[PDB]
From a paper:
The active ingredient of Bti is a parasporal body that contains three natural sub-micron-sized crystals of four highly efficient mosquito-specific toxins, namely Cyt1Aa, Cry11Aa and co-crystallizing Cry4Aa and Cry4Ba. Following ingestion by mosquito larvae, the crystals promptly dissolve in the alkaline environment of the gut (pH ~11), releasing protoxins that are activated into toxins through proteolytic cleavage of propeptides by gut enzymes. Each activated protein eventually self-assembles into cytolytic oligomers that perforate gut cells, leading to mosquito larvae death.
We produced sub-micron-sized crystals of Cyt1Aa in vivo by recombinant expression in an acrystalliferous strain of Bti (4Q7). Using SFX at the CXI-SC3 micro-focused beamline10 of the Stanford Linear Accelerator Center (SLAC) Linac Coherent Light Source (LCLS), diffraction data extending to 1.86 Å could be collected at room temperature (RT) for the wild-type (WT) Cyt1Aa protoxin at pH 7 (“pH7” dataset), from sub-micron-sized crystals injected by a MESH device. Clear residual density allowed us to build most of these residues (H6-L249). At the monomeric level, the Cyt1Aa protoxin displays a conformation overall similar to that of the activated toxin, with two outer layers of α-helix hairpins, αA/αB and αC/αD, respectively covering the hydrophilic and hydrophobic sides of a central five-stranded mixed β-sheet (namely β2-β5-β6-β7-β3). In vivo-grown Cyt1Aa protoxin crystals are remarkably packed, burying 40.1% of surface area at crystal contacts (5484.2 Å2 out of 13661.2 Å2 of total monomeric areas), compared with only 13.3% (1252.7 Å2 out of 9405.5 Å2) in crystals of the activated toxin grown in vitro. Examination at the unit-cell level reveals that the Cyt1Aa protoxin crystallizes as a domain-swapped (DS) dimer13 with strands β1 (contributed by the N-terminal propeptide) and β2 entwined at the DS interface (interface #1), aligned with a crystallographic two-fold axis. Formation of the DS dimer thus likely precedes crystallization in Bti cells. Strikingly, residues absent from the activated toxin structure are the main contributors to the packing of the natural crystals. Most notably, the N-terminal propeptide buries 73% of its surface area (2704 over 3691 Å2) across nine interaction zones, contributing 34 H-bonds, 10 salt-bridges and a disulfide bridge at position C7. This disulfide bridge is aligned with the other crystallographic two-fold axis.
Numbering used by the authors:
A (entry chain BBB), B (entry chain BBB): 6 to 249
Write the structure that this text describes.
């Protein structure tokens, strides 16, 4: 049943990941959290830590101006404020408040522009360790919005016949070989104006074309690792509920 | 600053969810898990339970036939077998092994056909409580494949000039008001033949058109709830690593 061939090693062929992906949708949390929590972890003993950082940066969400609409977005300035109050004491490594704009380009181009900004915040090493989740997360900021439209991290502002305003709040927690003894926390507040009506925006794909004016606010926060292996699960449950 | 208007109550306007969403990507788990774990929970004390069910149904994954390609898929038959060995003892409520086919239709139609099958497995009540995650999950089975292409739950089979074969493995754990004293576990193994080359499949959207022959294998498993609030986090870490 079929002679065994000598190995032809293709060094560019990407091997299948061994990473385990678990998504939690927690109905009716005690306290509301309006940040999509995306966690890239190699040691589950740092999950609680990751969740607590998301709990902290919920307080850095601010309302948009009335002209934009009735929405919440992560504020870099308020983020810095909040950062200094977090225990255990960490360090703000970087922060950005930058506008991004394109005219009559594919949504895929916009995604790339935003990725560029976030990769600058993360850095090469950090970027590389989370590239799949980061790419997905940014993709899901501009597309796949129908299933997300009523979720806690996205807010619809003013909706004209030519334009849709909406905010999108995502937080990345990273702990792996590229981070060492700290966990990086990167909250992102998107303020997005797009040149389509909401009904079209809801079904936008990477192929669609549109003009965007987008403000990106983010910081990168390094907190020394604290394992939670010895605490009861009740404490994790509490962290998730935001009551810890 | 602007007279307060009497309330105009629109009873169809869907309110924003309060649900908290947390995604974990666990790099280098001790034991490999090839099921995308999607958890709809109202009490985080049942997370460990949810993860342990995913650990169990990893053993119900079987290789496809050589004609299809080198892929793993959840097997309903092997699932039933595995079900009977799970402790604490639960009950197989339903199971399906059904082919789904369409000709020259939009991908959105295929998604709807698959949703129909999975909703039949779940039932009205259960379906309704997880509709967003279920819709997203099925959408992500047929689209958004580029960021997923190297992940642990998707396997690429034979790839011709006219057809692409791939498997997709997703597990839903549900615990809320619609489940009561049990948690429902619904693993799904997709075996998908699509009439496009891989390069196109990778960037398929809901708008694209294609022909599909798809086999869906799933069961619905009810396990009585066991809270884990009093165990150490180490046990959750262990469950995630599949060493518990
Ligand atoms: Na939906
Ligand atoms: Na990618």
């Amino acid at each position: 049943h079929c002679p065994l061939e000598d190995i032809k090693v293709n060094p560019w062929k990407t091997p299948q990941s061994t990473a385990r992906v678990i998504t939690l949708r927690v109905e009716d949390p005690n306290e509301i959290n309006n940040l999509l929590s995306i966690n890239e972890i190699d040691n589950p003993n740092y999950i609680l830590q990751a969740i607590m950082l998301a709990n902290a940066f919920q307080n850095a969400l601010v309302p948009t101006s009335t002209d934009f609409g009735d929405a919440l977005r992560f504020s870099m300035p308020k983020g810095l404020e909040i950062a200094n109050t977090i225990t255990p004491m960490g360090a703000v490594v970087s922060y950005v408040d930058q506008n991004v704009t394109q005219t009559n380009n594919q949504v895929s181009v916009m995604i790339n522009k935003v990725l560029e900004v976030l990769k600058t915040v993360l850095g090469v090493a950090l970027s590389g360790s989370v590239i799949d989740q980061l790419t997905a997360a940014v993709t899901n900021t501009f597309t796949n919005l129908n299933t997300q439209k009523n979720e806690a991290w996205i807010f619809w502002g003013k909706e004209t016949a030519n334009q849709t305003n909406y905010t999108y709040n995502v937080l990345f927690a990273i702990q792996n070989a590229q981070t060492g003894g700290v966990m990086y926390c990167v909250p992102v507040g998107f303020e997005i104006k797009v040149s389509a009506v909401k009904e079209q925006v809801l079904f936008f794909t990477i192929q669609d074309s549109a003009s965007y004016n987008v403000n990106i606010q983010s910081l990168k926060f390094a907190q020394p690792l604290v394992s939670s292996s010895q605490y009861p699960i009740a404490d994790l449950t509490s962290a998730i509920n935001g009551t810890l």
